[PDB]
């Protein structure tokens, strides 16, 4: 009942950006060039590269490929998704306004509420869950839209389509998607209307636990342009090295993503029959007030699930030191299964009296569930919650 | 007669930050912790999240810090990263004195990017101490300096320039000291307040890491600048970070080669009739060469001049060269030329490239470490190719 | 109707010899040491030997710089007069080795078909102390019954079973569950399965065999980067996601190329038509993304074939995410002796496919075209 | 009055194997190239690279340079030191005798010994700082003999050429020097006669203490072929990354060894002037026995430098235990001062790339604390 899978994906992501004649070895794969600079044949050069930061071969390949599964003409990469938010960010100019969703990241409520908001940029932080909200918040002033969805961490989900309707209506208005949590294997926000689709590419994209980095892609011409000037000129750029890791974790992010699909579907199903467990967040379950919206933009589902334990503080923390399997640890989207407490970890960044409306709350636990057998996994989970035994 | 050498400047560059007692290994080198993410013992609890913070990075940042004379050091993606990331310090309002002749993405990001968050940019001499005076209101809440400047190698007086910018309040001093590296020269025992480098060229010196480097001693402004670097995340990868810091440990033997080799390049340069005018730190001709002695304990492998004739015969130089590489950067092991105009500096106004000196004759060149009598028969040849009107 | 998959495969994959306790860091992926000097092997190393002996279910690996430097160390476990028994269709390197330098140094070398048990239980000799078998073999795919090859090379004398589990991989085959004494590897195909690491891996249970590889390990200094350690590591833990796909695509090309009528014939362990089927299926939990086939017509009709690929890449090597075909008689067994390969069956008209993890739709569409070029 | 440095050293260092004409990009350093195959045109053409294992871009890049810098036609680059001597081991066939000197690397006689010696191979060791018991122990069968110098730790230094006319004169009989400790900066083995100048990559070459890789530096044509044949066949083949960071380490040899030779000369002459040192063994100090081989031999001497503390092993061990800056370790040839206790007075010092008033100081500050006043 999903959207179908995207055409060519597996090979797309196996071999854009990684044709063998690129190089005079031919190598199947692309070499990991770290030249700083190049040389050039005379001067004023309107051919080859000139300066890593501002572009080489390395990025290039990576971004050729992200931008293909994304479905878009271009793509940009940054030393991280942080970096990535911050040179959008730079898109605009004093005067500007910022909306966001109300539940994101706890670094992106961070930068915009603490760093951007002195710069001359007025942020609003909005539910744009609820449509029409979005549509009475935008103002004249308004120049960028920043959603999440599903958000993190209480996997609020955003019609896209709609969203990008009521910011397209009027104005010149930026419509960025953060669609980490997702992968573009899940969820192509430009094919839905979006100007941006982003990533922190720290987590599922590269989905090794060993890269920092965010990607960028779009299809519009000028905004392009803008982007390309100033990931060369605020040079918040990824190492080549790191470049190649996550173009080589990227050819495996279609068969990644399906197990963190099937994985994270049991360990939702299985917290959801649990009687120490409250209640239980994943856009797969029927239980989820977007379920069906989710089935409608989206081809599956992540291994990310929120739920609230029964109980307190202490069952949630107790919960957390009886796993043996899951590990206590910030991040998510890689090979390995995470458990947090974004209240106290992740989201700490975010007020506090935020964080109560928002329901991050003492009992909110964040799973992001990896490749392990799906056996252990229920098993540790079962284990631990026996461990704490909250009131049933 | 330049300033004695820092004292255990070698000893530090291979030893601050490796102690082996830091690994369970007892590793001499530390190892390379690509690790995104590390265990906790309890919620919020040692390392987070590898951005925050990590083992390879710290390290590099406690060495670089021994280097500057510095308490702490932040690195970063790129020096125009660790740029942006000062900058941030500032609020709607500031105002910020750049320094006239600068790295053209220093320019662009000043002129045409700060400039549209509410702060106010100020271009200015700042090699003439009383133009900067001048130019301080109380909005200015940064200045920012390089010298030897780039590609024009003016120098500044650094502890006259912190004496005038501190005089009235709080105005940060950076000194973007990538030319020098802090074997040479240590902004911040001469009153800066920031050491500033892209790391890209000398302080790695392999021409194989992109990275930005900001030593700092103020506690306050130490945290400001922590904050920023987590919260804008413009970080180093943790492997080049490891090629930096590995980079590091031949930075005392790779400057003094670069000045020996310098030095014989700019002396070349200068009494070579194919020459208008030779811009070296080094040489008796330098307008501030005294100055230098007293601030440093060497020059640098960038040597700046001016061929005579036209564009014309710069073209026919950089053409004939077979040694040197036609190619933008600098502070590597391999000698480069370019011609700033055109290259690494088109993103400086034709205007203010002309005002400051910056014309279709000015050739830079960075020094490499290559046999001496090789680097001067290279550019012996290709004047001689060029044979402009002499 | 495969062997059930191996419990805890994938937990082990991703978790043996990566505890965080094992760094003062607690780190969730281990750190790349490279340093050569310790203050008074390596850790990344040893993490990796961990994991991949787990996988095997073996009490220890040792990890080489490649398939061939395991494969020389191994041999350096014998002496000279010692006798070895290969299989007959091998890794061309692997054949080129034995016979053409080995052999120099004082060691037997007996190629025999182990494929028929009868043929190894004659072939064995009182000199006879190292037993070497592919299977399924490269590229031809004969499929020996390891466990069987085990009773007998082990009823008498000292004799030590080697199987090359390249193709398979420990998530398909555990030569060690089966008797065998040695599961080694070149690493460098489905191992790693990212077609960027060169790298040797040597599985073993046995205590002294391991203290005697282990001393040849560091004796011979065949050891490999600890960086590439790592990188393999990390292209450990989608093994299971890997093969999975790997066996649904080589299956369907499988298929696809044995109902195809410019095909002679298709030797895939997973079709019925395979020789050996049965006897994969009790010793194999599934199959991989190796599909041998012969064309149709000649030497042009194969070079027309692989011309006319544009998905596929014509190249060497195999086991990486990428689809590769290539002429083994031309390419990967040139090393191998005319004579040799025509016996075998690696004809001018053998053909083998490496088949990666690129959309099912994608791949068949591009051998459906190329054979149509070759047979118009 | 040594051999003048040799020409174009730090040039070929940098240049050689690096020319961005190579890279469609024009990089000016060589890309890592982890590519373990690369595309073919049509099957079995005559054409660029097909496996990993037999050539890759990176590696070749790193072969080239370090051939130039050895004044060799051909490079062959290893896993190890290790990997590369069981390499040129492989050469030979059963029967044949290996004549290796006897005061070697303790990998290179344990190989002999212990594994070679089981495959048909004689192995003899000689005394071959006499060169007539050399001669006197070269049969028909001998095929290859192995010599190293200075030797580790008592750096006793041998006649290469003297070696070399030897063995040439007897025929078909390769001399390999083990050049680990000296690097192509300061000796150039294949200049004086030998066939093979070989390194352990691990100690000089590379010089950072963070890649484990050999090397071999040859000239002769069947010998480069036969050399060449076993890289592949055996496969004990380095990382593209390790040749990498190793190319990039060579870059500043020629800095970084003068720095050694500056610091180790220093130090040798600072113990040789210490009551409480009773003798130091260094090939720059007019008092080594064979400084005038050396001059010859050589273009300069390293950071290596062996000595002989007055007393007994408990001075010895009094003095390395109140080391504070040299590191006490087991390896070598790296930026970083180390010690070493392999006589029960005898201290080996790696010599590194500190400040040298450092280095002294520490030296002083331990030699006291054994020899209180
Ligand atoms: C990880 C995270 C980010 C931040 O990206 P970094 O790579 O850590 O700078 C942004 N958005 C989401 C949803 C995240 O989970
Ligand atoms: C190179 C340069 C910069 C910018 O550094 P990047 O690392 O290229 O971003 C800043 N200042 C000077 C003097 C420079 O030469
Ligand atoms: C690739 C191959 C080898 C040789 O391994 P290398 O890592 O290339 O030295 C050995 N056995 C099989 C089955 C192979 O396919
Ligand atoms: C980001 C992934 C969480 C982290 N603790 C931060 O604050 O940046
Ligand atoms: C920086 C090294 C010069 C460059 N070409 C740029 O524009 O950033
Ligand atoms: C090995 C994968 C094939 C190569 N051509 C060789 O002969 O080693």
Not at 57 to 73: F, I, Q, S, W, Y
């Amino acid at each position: 009942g999903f959207l179908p899978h995207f055409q060519h994906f597996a090979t797309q992501a196996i071999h854009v950006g990684q044709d063998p004649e690129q190089w005079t070895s031919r190598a199947v794969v692309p070499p990991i060039s770290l030249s700083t600079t190049f040389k050039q044949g005379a001067p004023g050069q309107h051919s080859g590269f000139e300066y890593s930061r501002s572009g080489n071969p390395t990025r290039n390949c990576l971004e050729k490929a992200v931008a293909a599964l994304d479905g878009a003409k271009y793509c940009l990469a940054f030393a991280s998704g942080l970096a990535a938010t911050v040179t959008i960010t730079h898109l605009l100019k004093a005067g500007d306004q910022i909306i966001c969703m109300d539940d994101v990241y706890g670094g992106t409520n961070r930068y915009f509420r603490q760093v951007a908001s002195e710069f001359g940029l007025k942020i609003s932080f909005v539910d744009c869950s609820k449509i029409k909200l979005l549509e009475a918040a935008i103002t004249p002033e308004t120049k960028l839209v920043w959603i999440e969805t599903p958000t993190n961490p209480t996997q609020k989900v955003i019609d896209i389509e709609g969203c990008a309707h009521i910011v397209h209506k009027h104005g010149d208005i930026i419509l960025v998607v953060d669609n980490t949590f997702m992968s573009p294997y899940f969820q192509r926000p430009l094919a839905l209307g979006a100007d941006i689709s982003m990533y922190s590419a720290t987590k599922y994209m590269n989905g090794h636990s060993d890269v920092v980095m965010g990607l960028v892609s779009v299809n519009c011409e000028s905004l392009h342009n803008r982007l390309r000037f100033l990931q060369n000129s605020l040079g918040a750029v990824p190492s080549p090295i790191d470049c190649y890791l996550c173009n080589r974790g990227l050819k495996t992010l279609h068969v990644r993503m399906e197990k963190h699909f099937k994985n994270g579907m049991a360990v939702a199903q299985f917290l959801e029959s649990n009687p120490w467990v409250e209640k239980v967040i994943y856009p797969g379950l029927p239980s989820h007030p977007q379920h069906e919206l989710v089935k409608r933009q989206c081809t599956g589902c992540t291994g990310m699930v929120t739920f609230y334990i029964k109980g307190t503080l202490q069952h949630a923390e107790i919960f957390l030191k009886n796993l043996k399997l899951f590990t206590l640890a910030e991040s998510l989207g890689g090979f390995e299964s995470l458990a947090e407490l974004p209240a106290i970890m992740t989201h700490a960044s975010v007020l506090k009296n935020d964080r109560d409306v928002l329901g991050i709350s003492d009992t909110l636990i964040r799973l992001s569930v990896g490749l392990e057998d799906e056996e252990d996994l229920l098993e540790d989970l079962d284990q631990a919650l026996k461990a704490a035994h909250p009131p049933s």
